[PDB]
Amino acid sequence: GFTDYKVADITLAAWGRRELIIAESEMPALMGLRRKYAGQQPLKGAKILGCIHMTINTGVLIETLVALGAEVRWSSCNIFSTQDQAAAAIAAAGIPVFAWKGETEEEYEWCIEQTILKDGQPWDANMVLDDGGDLTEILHKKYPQMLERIHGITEETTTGVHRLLDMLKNGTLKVPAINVNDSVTKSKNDNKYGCRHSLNDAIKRGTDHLLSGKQALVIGYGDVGKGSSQSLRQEGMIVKVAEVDPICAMQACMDGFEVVSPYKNGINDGTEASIDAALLGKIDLIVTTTGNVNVCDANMLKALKKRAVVCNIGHFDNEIDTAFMRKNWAWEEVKPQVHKIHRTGKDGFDAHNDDYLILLAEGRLVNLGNATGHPSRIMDGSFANQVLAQIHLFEQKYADLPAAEKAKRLSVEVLPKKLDEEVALEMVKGFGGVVTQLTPKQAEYIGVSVEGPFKPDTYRY
Amino acid sequence: GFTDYKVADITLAAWGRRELIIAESEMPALMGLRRKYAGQQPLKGAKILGCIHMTINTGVLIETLVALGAEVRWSSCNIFSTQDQAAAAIAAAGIPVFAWKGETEEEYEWCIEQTILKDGQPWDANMVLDDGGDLTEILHKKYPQMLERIHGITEETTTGVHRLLDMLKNGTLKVPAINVNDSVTKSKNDNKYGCRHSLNDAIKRGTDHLLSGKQALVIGYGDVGKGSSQSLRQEGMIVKVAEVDPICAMQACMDGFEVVSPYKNGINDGTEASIDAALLGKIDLIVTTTGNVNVCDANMLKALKKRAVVCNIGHFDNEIDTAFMRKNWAWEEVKPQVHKIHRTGKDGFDAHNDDYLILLAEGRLVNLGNATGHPSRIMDGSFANQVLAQIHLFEQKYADLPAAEKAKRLSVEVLPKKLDEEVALEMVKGFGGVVTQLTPKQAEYIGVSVEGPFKPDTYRY
Amino acid sequence: MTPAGFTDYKVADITLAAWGRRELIIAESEMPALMGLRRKYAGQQPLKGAKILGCIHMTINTGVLIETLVALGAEVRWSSCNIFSTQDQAAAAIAAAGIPVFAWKGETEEEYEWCIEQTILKDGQPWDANMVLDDGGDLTEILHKKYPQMLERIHGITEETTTGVHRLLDMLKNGTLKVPAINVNDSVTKSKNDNKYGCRHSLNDAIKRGTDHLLSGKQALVIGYGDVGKGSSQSLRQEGMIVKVAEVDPICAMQACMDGFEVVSPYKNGINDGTEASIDAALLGKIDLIVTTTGNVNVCDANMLKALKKRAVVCNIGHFDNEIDTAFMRKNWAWEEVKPQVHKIHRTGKDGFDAHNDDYLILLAEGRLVNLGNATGHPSRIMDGSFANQVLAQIHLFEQKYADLPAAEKAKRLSVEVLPKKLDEEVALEMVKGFGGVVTQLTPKQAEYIGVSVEGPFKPDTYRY
Amino acid sequence: GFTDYKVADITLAAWGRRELIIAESEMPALMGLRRKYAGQQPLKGAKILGCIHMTINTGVLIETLVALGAEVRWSSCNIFSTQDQAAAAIAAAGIPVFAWKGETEEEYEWCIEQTILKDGQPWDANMVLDDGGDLTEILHKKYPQMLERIHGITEETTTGVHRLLDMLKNGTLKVPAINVNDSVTKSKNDNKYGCRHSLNDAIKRGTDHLLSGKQALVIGYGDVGKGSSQSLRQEGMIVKVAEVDPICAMQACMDGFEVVSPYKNGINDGTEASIDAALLGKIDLIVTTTGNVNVCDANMLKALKKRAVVCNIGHFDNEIDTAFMRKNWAWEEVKPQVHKIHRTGKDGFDAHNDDYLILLAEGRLVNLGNATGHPSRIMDGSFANQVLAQIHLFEQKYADLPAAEKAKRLSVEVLPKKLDEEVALEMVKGFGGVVTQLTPKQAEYIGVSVEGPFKPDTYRY
Ligand SMILES: NC(=O)c1ccc[n+]([C@@H]2O[C@H](COP(=O)([O-])OP(=O)(O)OC[C@H]3O[C@@H](n4cnc5c(N)ncnc54)[C@H](O)[C@@H]3O)[C@@H](O)[C@H]2O)c1
Ligand SMILES: NC(=O)c1ccc[n+]([C@@H]2O[C@H](COP(=O)([O-])OP(=O)(O)OC[C@H]3O[C@@H](n4cnc5c(N)ncnc54)[C@H](O)[C@@H]3O)[C@@H](O)[C@H]2O)c1
Ligand SMILES: NC(=O)c1ccc[n+]([C@@H]2O[C@H](COP(=O)([O-])OP(=O)(O)OC[C@H]3O[C@@H](n4cnc5c(N)ncnc54)[C@H](O)[C@@H]3O)[C@@H](O)[C@H]2O)c1
Ligand SMILES: NC(=O)c1ccc[n+]([C@@H]2O[C@H](COP(=O)([O-])OP(=O)(O)OC[C@H]3O[C@@H](n4cnc5c(N)ncnc54)[C@H](O)[C@@H]3O)[C@@H](O)[C@H]2O)c1
Ligand SMILES: Nc1ncnc2c1ncn2[C@@H]1O[C@H](CO)[C@@H](O)[C@H]1O
DSSP, X not given: OOOXXXXXXXXGHHHHHHHHHHHHHTOHHHHHHHHHHTTTOTTTTOEEEEESOOSHHHHHHHHHHHHTTOEEEEEXXXXXXXXXHHHHHHHHTTOOEEEOTTOOHHHHHXXXXXXXXXXXXXXXXXXXXXXXXXXXXXXXXXXXXXXXXXXXXXXXXXXXXXXXXXXXXXXXXXXXXXXXXXXXXXXXXXIIIXXXXXXXXXXXXXXXXXXXXXXXXXEOOSHHHHHHHHHHXXXXXXXXXXXXXXXXXXXXXXXXXXXXXXXXXXXXXXXXXXXXXXXXXXXXXXXXXXXXXXXXXXHHHHHSOTTOEEEEOSSTTTTXXXXXXXXXXXXXXXXXXXXXXXXXXXXXXXXXXXOEEEEEGGXXXXXXXXXXXXXXXXXXXXXXXXXXXXHHHHHXXXXXXXXXXXXXXXXXXXXXXXXXXXHHHHHHHHTTOXXXXXXXXXXXXXXXXXXXXXXXXXXXX | OOOOXXXXXXXXXXXXXXXXXXXXXXXXXXXXXXXXXXXXXXTTTXXXXXXXXXXXXXXXXXXXXXXXXXXXEEEOSSSSOOOHHHHHHHHHTTOOEEOOTXXXXXXXXXXXXXXXXXXXXXXXXXXXXXXXXXXXXXXXXXXXXXXXXXOOEEEOSHHHHHHHXXXXXXXXXXXXXXXXXXXXXXXXXXXXXXXXXXXXHHHHHHHOOOOTTOXXXXXXXXXXXXXXXXXXXXXXXXXXXXXXXXXXXXHHHHTXXXXXOSBGXXXXXXXXXXXXXXHHTTOSEEEEXXXXXXXXXXXXXXXSOTTXXXXXXXXXXXXXXXXXXXXXXXXXXXXXXXXXXXXXXXXXOOTTOSOEEEEEGGGSBHHHHHSOOSOHXXXXXXXXXXXXXXXXXXXXXXXXXXXXXXXXXXXXXXXXHHHHHXXXXXXXXXXXXXXXXXXXXXXXXXTOOTTSXXXXXXXXX | OXXXXXXXXXXXXXXXXXXXXXXXXXXXXXXXXXXXXXXXXXXXXXXXXXXXXXXXXXXXXXXXXXXXHHHTTOEEEEEOSSSSOOOHHHXXXXXXXXXXXXXXTTOOHHHHHXXXXXXXXXXXXXXXXXXXXXXXXXXXXXXXXXXXXXXXXXXXXXXXXXXXXXXXXXXXXXXXXXXOEEEOTTSHHXXXXXXXXXXHHHHHHHHHHHHOOOOTTOEEEEEOOSHHHHHHHHHHHTTTOEEEXXXXXXXXXXXXXXXXXXXXXSBGGGOOOSSGGGBOHHHHTTOSEEEEOSSSSOSBOHHHHXXXXXXXXXXXXXXXXXXXXXXXXXXXXXXXXXXXXXXXXXXXXXXXOOTTOSOEEEEEGGGSBHHHHHSOOSOHHHHHHHHXXXXXXXXXXXXXXXXXXXXXXXXXXXXXXXXXXXXXXXXXXXXXHHTTOOOOOOOHHHHHHXXXXXXXXXXXXXXXX | OOOOOBOSOGGGHHHHHHHHHHHHHTOHHHHHHHHHHTTTOTTTTOEEEEESOOSHHHHHHHHHHHHTTOEEEEEOSSSSOOOHHHHHHHHHTTOOXXXXXXXXXXXHXXXXXXXXXXXXXXXXXXXXXXXXXXXXXXXXXXXXXXXXXXXXXXXXXXXXXXXXXXXXXXXXXXXXXXXXXXXXXXXXXXXIIIHHHHHHHHHHHHHOOOOTTOEEEEEOOSHHHHHHHHHHHTTTOEEEEEOSOHHHHHHHHHTTOEEOOSBGGGOOXXXXXXXXXXXXXXXXXXXXXXXXXXXXXXXXXHHSOTTOEEEEOSSSTTTBTHHHHHHHSEEEEEETTEEEEETTOSSOOOTTOSOEEEEEGGGSBHHHHHSOOSOHHHHHHHHHHHHHHHHHHHHHTGGGSOHHHHHHHOOEEOOOHHHHHHHHHHHHHHTTOOOOOOOHHHHHHHTOXXXXXXXXXXOOO
């Protein structure tokens, strides 16, 4: 008589279990942690509030935390990212999950609240696993008493880490965090190669458009922008890249991209006259990758080529000015997470109007909204880091330290390089890769241990 | 009556000047520093011992240092890297240079000694520019009194920085250094994209071999290994990558390379039995990128496919066991910097023997030995960093500080991110790239200044 | 629906029609050659009186083809040429427009044959068909074997695909072909567009939808390096797969080598003597993904399937399901459906499986065309070329009126032909303009210098592109 | 006492022999023909006038024809294409060769004349091997008596075949020809993949310019244009493609190139107004691939970005209007086969002028002029076809046929597909490729013989 969940359709559970059993075979670092630590139960007593895309891959993470002794209460960090069969499989395993694909904003907030509360009272939570910081922010604003008993936060993504670092700077962060994002086996795996796999995937599922020989503008050339640019270029798109960071821009040039600004001489003065109308008039696809606000603004949307596709693979819905499009233009649903945005006006539209844009996932994460996000073998690295970060912070028991000792441990930190390397090795073995062992003379020659770490913490890979 | 130089052929000077004038047009960051600092003469009174590849690109660096007020005495850091027309053009400008292509080891040492000594006595040197640490080591071992008057070292390359850091750890480093290598506009420009341009270049000039559809083994997947692997794969080579670092190996896998070891299960126990003879029997091209010793060892060389090409783009000549090949096998010169190594024995060889390897540049830096190394537009970034580093250390005047103040400034440092970004922006403008400017709201949203820096010092790009 | 009381169709779900119409309106904007033909020929109605039996994948793209034929004056009766290729929203939109269509995703073999029969028969009697549009030759074969009298009134066949063309040429050689045909496949704007670039787009698409597997850094074996093999190999290599290519044609193998692929055989020294000992078990033990592209039989045979790495994906993008020995797998191994068109094939035996068994293969679309079975096949802008050629071929054969010729005149016109290069060039130009491409015009001096007309054709018929 | 040759320097012979011995190991189809036909001497009595680039690769062809019993007299078909060490090695083998790198037009004609005449009288020639048709045209215009006794022409290249077909159409062709170009193992090997290898090679040797991130315009998208486009794109160039053939243009689009015209709406009026000044103002590199005339015209050259590189990889130097540049602009030699073309005027230039173009190989074949042309393993296919074509026409003995029988055999033909496949198989084995054999059932199923041919003559590959 387990009822402590809310999912689209519990009857999808058997399908979800079939997909979990396949995904496990794609996730050797995660399954290795299960086999290694199952006996020791290092998360026994851990009670984890989890807020991350309720996908099959997240399912393998959840069941790894549970297999290591954790109890969890789970929600999605995005209204469109859930795989309903994954959510069903987790609910049917007796794990509290509050997630479905196509939540309203009200339902999204209700789902997070259902993780925080059990039977109408704060759950005895002592750990947080977050993606983007929404759960972190709700706990700090609304449930500070709960944070007193929480040993730490493990934060998945660039945007969430930024929000943690703001809180640390302002003296408002109440518990230590591990920045899972900045593991090399996360940032330079998931952020880059995940988006390389999943961006063209989502655009194909959403539009089935030929990409080869068409014009893309990728806004950003960080990890996600690099992966996104490659996703499109490898399909034969002609990709132009926009950046504010000259080092990232230099990388775009050397990687064989033309670096352009949507604005004349790169100056965004907020006027239509500032828009390079000739450039935007030629673009078939714009992708936002920034973690920033209004990088595809109203004036850019007005200037875009007719029938251009617009999408966002970085954070929230405000990289693209969707608020402007809701206020001014008529939305025609093609199918779920695909809208034609008719630039002819707000009230009606002509079914045969040629002056529209195609918006994917209403400007939310396109890879998860219009496809299934990163593949298992990539998320294996991110999620092995999550499990190790949960173990580290849980075992440190911050909430049980004296005030003086808390002051010294209240930080946002990355996992040590040795763990990053061990996750990498399990990932390499999953490809059938064979890593060479240094000889003693070779290890002495370059000044490292035969078992590593092989690089100083300053190394950028 | 200028005679304070030694070059192959002074009559090549006019040709060298023609090539310097073209190279200047490819090096906007360097020529920007000339225009910026020429008036102020920030290196007036600087007396720079330089030891770096006497190429056309090094020529533009030398003339930038001189245009900012430096005097220099110059040698090459490699016996095969000099462009004789570049050396001639620098000598013809009245700058002391001791460099030619195809030096002996004795001539190499003599050339460095001719920079250190002027008219049989130590030069009144006060700055060092080094590539690989040979000049740095000679000053510390043989001329320690000269280091009393030296304000600093600016070190070009990964291997040289390793040697500096050993000296710092052991308390044997006598003057502060700038690690130029670990600027992003050096390491993730020069080390990677330089080798992408110049490795297939050198292999074509040396062998004219088709690379498409043939089998390569790249030992190492650091910045040089990454660029080297792309150099070959973009030509259609089937590239396998060897690594000791599982994170680098993980990147090789994600980049679409098979990761293999020369040794069964990656264990080099020193025996022939440990060699994967089946793997090495299929390899047409082996490239070493490691900075390590004996990564292409005698047993690997014995097991390699007949008529395989062997080359090193890392350091020294000891990445490949060339000593074993000189001791055991007969060398037939095809043309300069190309030898057939006859595995039939040491004494004679049959002109028609089928059992040989092709060694490029006698196992020394293949890009500079068999071609012209990195292109001007790439070296522009490295050398803009060198000039800014020379300015910083010269203006700090370490050698004139009291003992107490020296103790605090005796360090190996990178340039600030802000300077790295300024070099990057000049490089981007040379591609016709346009960097977007953040709005105040956007800069506040992601927590950076509109002027940058745009990333924390932890950012890996 | 549209027509009062219309019931002359069978589709999965008529309520998908509005959705299908939304997708047709988008696809039209991606298909300028096809929409150009509509605008050009609408007034002239060159297919007025044409009654076309069509058998091709009932996709959104096929929907734009059908409505082009109807806009030019044709009546049609339509079925899919594959049990898994139909997009049910496309089928619904076509039925709702009052066009007879018999197609759904996930037909049985019985349902497949019934659907073709429903195009051929109207109210239980042969339709007064006078044209055939076919993809793979099944409808062509049924008319020749079962309804020869209907071919007396048929002016021509226009055939989409390599396999169908092969079957037409066998019929011509054997003197059994009863009406002339246009080989649409061998337009350059078909073969070297659709067969290659279509598969480049749609193969990795179908593998992602079907498995969501990371391809980067994993090992693929592509069997074949014709147009489909070339496009398939690029689909995987551009994702970072380590692709090995098998071929029987040394010229295609040479192209694979030059394109940067290792050319290997499943069999030692390339000799398939039918023994297990002939299988290169070491090579197949390393393969994560096998793709068949040949149009040939048993190119991924039982012994190869036995030797494949555990949890390898197996799929076919060649026109029929016998490229892989699926019959051997149905006979010997237990099939576990993951989801539609995805099965785990448990090599532990026939009767039952352990849910947690590690010794299985993943088969996509039960060995049938994987791009159409697990995704949506080629994109609109590619199918535009193929389908512009189909419309031109239909116009040509319908206007020639073969069925109304005297016996002596028929003998001379009974052939399998391609469209003239000038039409191939005109399709290509409309495709280029859809990319915003600008084709240069030769000067008179330049046209004289290379010996062509300023208007083309620009190449002799021998040119291979 | 062998003196029947003219080369740059006979002392280069030993070096040329070293390179021939290596090149043989890269050319298994050619070396296979030697082993197969040695004993049978199928070219015994053949006396071949050869006119093709006197490269190392051509050396292996010559020595194959000689090993099969031919005598030859050889010249280059290009003033810049000879490798002087190859010419020396062939002369030192007692083979008449008249070729050096850097011929004048007068020297070029004299060299062809020295093949045609022996001791001041027509040689007893009975076979012609040609590349571009210059020798073929001289024989038809000036030596028709010699053509009476010639059994055939084997023609290497697209331009030469066009010239043969015009002669056949006009009834002026006097002997049958094999179109060696349209073997698949020639056209879709040499013309495409050869240029992919050798175009970026020649641009690097000639300029050492970084190509990554820079803008290229490739005029033409035939076999050479396809390979040239890839040569640049694989290096990271942003490649735009021009074409007059909409099918080739369609292929460029699908291959992921933007298709542009130098002229507004593609219409060349002959006026400056017709030039797209904005487009040409952004181009760093223009490459002509057409076999057509004035496809990089005077107005395009005037509009090109300052310091753009201009080159031609089509068979003759009239693709670029070099005549306009000789008439109007000052040429500064950088080094052999590299000129700065100063757009400031005809009589003198400022050494520091910024307004110049860089022209490679004075507008002649850039791959052979500035590098070594196609690699051995590619030329192996072309030259295996040449040998089989020489055998076929020599054995047919056209010159000895009655007039009635000649009339029936006077044609321009390709080799049978079966021979194309046999060359391909030897090329594949040189990669270590393993071709599968059809079963009898499989062969019957697709309607071919187990031993081929595998495709109908209509197949395009
Ligand atoms: N969809 C996914 O699966 C996925 C994967 C990982 C991360 N993310 C999200 O993607 C976003 C980016 O993450 P990242 O790791 O690449 O961060 P990053 O800091 O590496 O890169 C972001 C880049 O955006 C650039 N940028 C900022 N404002 C810009 C503007 N106005 N114009 C142009 N460029 C601008 C910055 O200079 C920076 O290089 C974040 O929101 C992150 O959480 C999503
Ligand atoms: N030739 C040039 O123009 C050029 C350019 C820059 C740097 N370099 C030189 O290249 C070398 C590498 O530079 P880098 O910046 O790539 O350094 P790096 O540390 O980034 O990369 C070296 C890599 O070698 C790997 N490695 C070490 N021992 C190995 C072994 N036994 N087998 C396999 N892999 C092994 C390490 O794990 C590391 O990832 C240095 O010697 C550097 O000075 C040369
Ligand atoms: N799925 C799609 O959307 C799509 C696209 C177009 C064509 N097709 C089908 O794809 C198939 C191939 O079409 P194509 O145009 O590429 O034909 P093709 O003749 O160009 O290529 C087929 C290749 O298979 C090779 N081959 C034959 N037997 C082989 C064997 N035993 N092992 C290895 N290679 C072998 C041949 O040598 C040939 O090169 C046909 O069935 C065609 O109808 C499907
Ligand atoms: N340098 C070498 O090693 C090498 C190799 C092989 C062939 N070639 C020569 O290269 C040339 C091309 O050979 P190919 O086999 O590619 O010929 P091709 O006919 O295959 O290609 C030439 C292309 O140029 C296009 N073209 C013609 N005029 C044009 C114009 N004004 N603007 C744009 N495009 C135009 C044509 O449409 C055609 O597609 C010939 O001269 C051939 O002999 C040189
Ligand atoms: N398939 C997936 N399952 C779960 N999380 C994912 C998936 N794909 C991407 N993500 C995560 O989404 C985050 C952005 O919210 C990224 O940091 C990435 O780690």
